[PDB]
Amino acid sequence: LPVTLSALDLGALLCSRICHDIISPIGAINNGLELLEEGGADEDAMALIKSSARNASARLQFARIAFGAAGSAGVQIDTGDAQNVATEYFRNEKPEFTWEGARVLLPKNKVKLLLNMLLIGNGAIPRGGSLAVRLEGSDTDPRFVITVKGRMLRVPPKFLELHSGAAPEEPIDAHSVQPYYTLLLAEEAGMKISIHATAEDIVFSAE
Amino acid sequence: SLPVTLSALDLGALLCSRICHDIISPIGAINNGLELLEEGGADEDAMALIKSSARNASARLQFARIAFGAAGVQIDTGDAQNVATEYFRNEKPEFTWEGARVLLPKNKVKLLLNMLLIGNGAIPRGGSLAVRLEGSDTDPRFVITVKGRMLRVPPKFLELHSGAAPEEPIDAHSVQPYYTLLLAEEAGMKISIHATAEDIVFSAE
Ligand code: NA
Structure with a gap:
């Protein structure tokens, strides 16, 4: 109401918000891969990769509908x-x-x-x-x-x-x-x- | 001039759908690899899929931050x-x-x-x-x-x-x-x- 964003600025900031929200779980996937290559705790590393990928997926699917145009024709x-x-x-x-x-x-x-x-x-x-x-x-x-x-x-x-x-x-x-x-x-x-x-x-x- | 115009809401929604789609795909691939790894029988293939997909996801995220986001x-x-x-x-x-x-x-x-x-x-x-x-x-x-x-x-x-x-x-x-x-x-x-x-x-x- 009291302020308005241009189409370009709204789109950019929404995209930044989605990116910001997945940086950590995608980073943890990469960390898990590093731990896996270091050896000694392969099961823990795989479990981390699994939960972090599930986290990233959940955030992307939620964003697809809450911010995106998905689920609709x-x-x-x-x-x-x-x-x-x-x-x-x-x-x-x-x-x-x-x-x-x-x-x-x-x-x-x-x-x-x-x-x-x-x-x-x-x-x-x-x-x-x-x-x-x-x-x-x-x-x-x-x-x-x-x-x-x-x-x-x-x-x-x-x-x-x-x-x-x-x-x-x-x-x-x-x-x-x-x-x-x-x-x-x-x-x-x-x-x-x-x-x-x-x-x-x-x-x-x-x- | 552009022959069509999108509202702020519609442009925002479609841009978000595009980046979600482009990063969902390699994250989805990691999940497929994880299911395959748990089954055994092609552990090397499943791990290679996970690794290549993690790199894809990271690369697409960093590119999107600047190309689409405000960064x-x-x-x-x-x-x-x-x-x-x-x-x-x-x-x-x-x-x-x-x-x-x-x-x-x-x-x-x-x-x-x-x-x-x-x-x-x-x-x-x-x-x-x-x-x-x-x-x-x-x-x-x-x-x-x-x-x-x-x-x-x-x-x-x-x-x-x-x-x-x-x-x-x-x-x-x-x-x-x-x-x-x-x-x-x-x-x-x-x-x-x-x-x-x-x-x-x-x-x-
Ligand atoms: Na989840």
Whole structure:
């Protein structure tokens, strides 16, 4: 709302964000190969390569739908696909992850909004906890509810800032592009995000 | 001018789909190799697959960081040379680079790297791809020369560059020639194509 990125700058920052998120697991694959060649712990090295490749794959498949155009011809996305890539993604994240709600075809940007709200939620519990998703409403008027609980509970400051309609203090970059993008998707989809924060939990909801 | 236009949301989505696709493939190959290694019977083959795919994934990641990502205002062509050289080590054509190392506006260097992908696309059975950097730092000129057994300007690039709208919408494949042209437009540079029976020269200035 208060700031806008050019097509070139949005695309570049989203690409940087995806790259940033896979540097470590792809690096660990290379580390595993180095350990394997050094010998003495071949099983550990292979296990590392396996889990790091699974991590990289999960992040790429999630990005394919949350940031990319995948799962769509376009126009619609199957929330069953969204549930699958989200569940595998959170296998490599701290919170205990649950998903509730009927499998449904929805406009692509509404499902992309949903997946991006998971990332905001994850950011709100940086010391872990639980992230629970509920799909509610109708297929014409969906409602997404993302509820997080954990020892550290805080609305991500950049998201709070942008969502309140305030221009950012520093330029949008590969970190802040994701909350910017989340709000952009909500605007595009004609949906409004609400934040309800208590001492027990934070609920991010959209409708 | 480009005969089609993408919204910020659609360009962002298609660029992300393209890099996801290009790095998913070798990561997927590692996973196939891991399944095969666990089965035994071709351990050497499975390990060679894992190793070659890890190098592909790393090379594509580092190239994407600069060619597609935002990695401030200027880019050092030395960094472009480094990621391009490693990328093409894992590709068919013989790759060479000539020209003074220079700091240039980021989109001009992104244009350069994206022109390499078009060049690579023009020689699908291999050959040589040669880069020359010319001109001044205010008026750079890029020259990409390809030679090979098969020479063909990638049809989607030819179509878009010639000003004809495509019969089908831009997708995760054709977004790359679209982006190449879009970068040239923002940078105020013009791409010319000189295709003969002997070689194809893509130049920008
Ligand atoms: Na995983």
